[PDB]
């Protein structure tokens with residue numbers, strides 16, 4: 624009888640660069656006993672440190688998950704009567720990481736833009752925090768006096784200050800956060 628594959632789980636999530644591993648399983652009914660084998664990118668998966676195969680190839684463990692591990696892994700079952708193929712799929716998430724947060728200067732009575740840029744999957748939300756008083760800015764938000772405004776989209780945010788004052792100087796933090804976690808970095812605004 625032709626091989627018929629069963630899978631407990633077919634879609635999987637993992638987070639990159641955390642030393643995580645996941646195990647895909649593939650079993651098949653059929654006579655004669657179907658032989659199970661796994662493919663990635665169309666090439667047979669051979670056992671090593673990264674890929675662990677157990678239970679006559681019924682279980683595939685991918686170790687030390689990184690972004691490039693994302694995608695389809697194909698389970699093939701074959702016997703003299705025919706073959707069946709099914710895919711397991713791995714979505715790899717990436718925790719937020721701020722990749723750009725520069726220091727800035729401007730002069731009193733001037734204008735300045737603080738820029739924070741972050742990577743991540745999901746795309747992180749960006750929040751700004753003013754060190755001296757711990758006041759936080761999201762969105763969208765603006766200051767009571769209307770001088771400060773936050774605009775941002777797609778994991779990037781600008782904090783814009785109009786009519787700078789000496790007291791605006793000091794540390795500002797960017798916080799990039801997703802369900803996965805968060806990353807915070809600091810820069811320094813010098814009004815001088």
Ligand SMILES: *[C@@H]1O[C@H](CO)[C@@H](O)[C@H](O)[C@H]1NC(C)=O
Pocket residue numbers: 634635636714
């Ligand atoms: C994988 O993550 C996605 C996106 O958050 C979620 O919708 C899905 O249910 C997850 N799959 C799991 C863990 O079963």
Ligand SMILES: *[C@@H]1O[C@H](CO)[C@@H](O)[C@H](O)[C@H]1NC(C)=O
Pocket residue numbers: 724725726810811
């Ligand atoms: C901002 O803070 C000081 C300025 O003296 C410096 O040590 C630090 O590297 C600056 N940050 C950047 C990204 O230039």
